[PDB]
Design a protein around this ligand. Structure first.
Ligand SMILES: CN(c1ncccc1/C=N/c1nc(Nc2ccccc2)ncc1C(F)(F)F)S(C)(=O)=O
Length: 261
C-alpha cells in the first residue's frame, strides 16, 4: 500500500535540505495513472536501524492526516537508500512567493492564505494534535489560490522564540492555545509579504518586551478587523485566545467583506 518501487521515480533538482538528507523534486510514474510531480525526502545515513526508524515515523505521522491544505504522503521506498515520497507544491516556499509577488498580489489572496491555514489547523485541533511550529517558513504554495502546511518532519522544531507563546518560552508548555499564538505571527508575516517578525531584536530581549505588553505592529493595508483578530491570538493568558473554529469563521467573514470591497 505505502511501498513504492524506486524505478518508478525520476529524481530531479534539490529543493531543500532536511535533518536526514536532501529533499528533491521529481516524477512518480504511478502504476495505472498519469505521472505525478513529487517531493523526495532522502536519507544519507539510514543504513543503521536507529536513523532508519526515526525517518520512517515522519511518513507515518503524515499518513494519519487527510486535509486539502496539508501535504500528503505518496509512499516510501524502504530498501537502501530509504526515501519518502510526498506531494509537490509546485510554486515553492511561501515567504519567497510573497516577497517576489510583493506588488503582484492582492489583499484578498493574502486573507485566503490565512483562511486556508486556519482550516488545516482546526482539522489538526479536531485530532488533538499540537503542531509546535507554525510559521510562514513551513508553508508551501501549490497554486496562486492554494497554500499548504509543509512536512512535519522537515519543520525544524517539532528554538523559534519570535513565534512562540510566553508559556512555551517560559515553561516549554505546548498546547493548541500556544499554536494559536504562532498562527497569529504567521498571519502577520503573510500580511507583511514575507517579512520576519522582530527584526533587529535579540531572542532574549523578545520575552522582556512581550511581558511588558509589546506586540507586532499593524501591517500596512491590513484591515483593522484582521489586526484585531491577530491581537486576540496574542493574549498573554492562553484561555483568552480564540480557538481555530472561531478563527476560521472570522477569517471567512473578513475574506468575503474584502471580496465585496
Ligand atoms: C520548508 N520545508 C522544507 N524544509 C526542508 C526541506 C525541504 C522543504 C520543502 N518541502 C517540500 N517542498 C515542496 N515544494 C518546493 C519547495 C521549495 C522549492 C521548490 C518546491 N513541496 C513539498 C514539500 C514537502 F512535502 F516535502 F514538504 S517544509 C518544513 O515546508 O517541508
Amino acid at each position: 500500500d505505502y511501498e513504492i518501487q524506486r524505478e518508478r521515480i525520476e529524481l530531479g533538482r534539490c529543493i531543500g535540505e532536511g535533518q536526514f538528507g536532501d529533499v528533491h523534486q521529481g516524477i512518480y510514474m504511478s502504476p495505472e495513472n498519469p505521472a505525478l510531480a513529487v517531493a523526495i525526502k532522502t536519507c544519507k545515513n539510514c543504513t543503521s536501524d536507529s536513523v532508519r526508524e526515526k525517518f520512517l515515523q515522519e511518513a507515518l505521522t503524515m499518513r494519519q492526516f487527510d486535509h486539502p491544505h496539508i501535504v500528503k504522503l505518496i509512499g516510501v521506498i524502504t530498501e537502501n537508500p530509504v526515501w519518502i515520497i510526498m506531494e509537490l507544491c509546485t510554486l515553492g516556499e511561501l515567504r519567497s512567493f510573497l516577497q517576489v509577488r510583493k506588488y503582484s498580489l492582492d489583499l484578498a489572496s493574502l486573507i485566503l492564505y490565512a483562511y486556508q491555514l486556519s482550516t488545516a489547523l482546526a482539522y489538526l485541533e479536531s485530532k488533538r494534535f499540537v503542531h509546535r511550529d507554525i510559521a510562514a517558513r513551513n508553508v508551501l504554495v501549490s497554486s496562486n489560490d492554494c497554500v499548504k502546511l509543509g512536512d512535519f518532519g522537515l519543520s525544524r522544531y517539532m528554538l523559534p522564540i519570535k513565534w512562540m507563546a510566553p508559556e512555551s518560552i517560559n515553561f516549554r508548555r505546548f498546547t493548541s492555545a500556544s499554536d494559536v499564538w504562532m498562527f497569529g505571527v504567521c498571519m502577520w508575516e503573510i500580511l507583511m509579504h514575507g517579512v520576519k517578525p522582530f527584526q533587529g531584536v535579540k531572542n532574549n530581549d523578545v520575552i522582556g518586551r512581550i511581558e511588558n505588553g509589546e506586540r507586532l505592529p499593524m501591517p500596512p493595508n491590513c484591515p483593522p478587523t484582521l489586526y484585531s483578530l491577530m491581537t486576540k491570538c496574542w493574549a498573554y493568558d492562553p484561555s483568552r485566545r480564540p480557538r481555530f473554529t472561531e478563527l476560521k469563521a472570522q477569517l471567512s467573514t473578513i475574506l468575503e467583506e474584502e471580496k465585496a470591497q
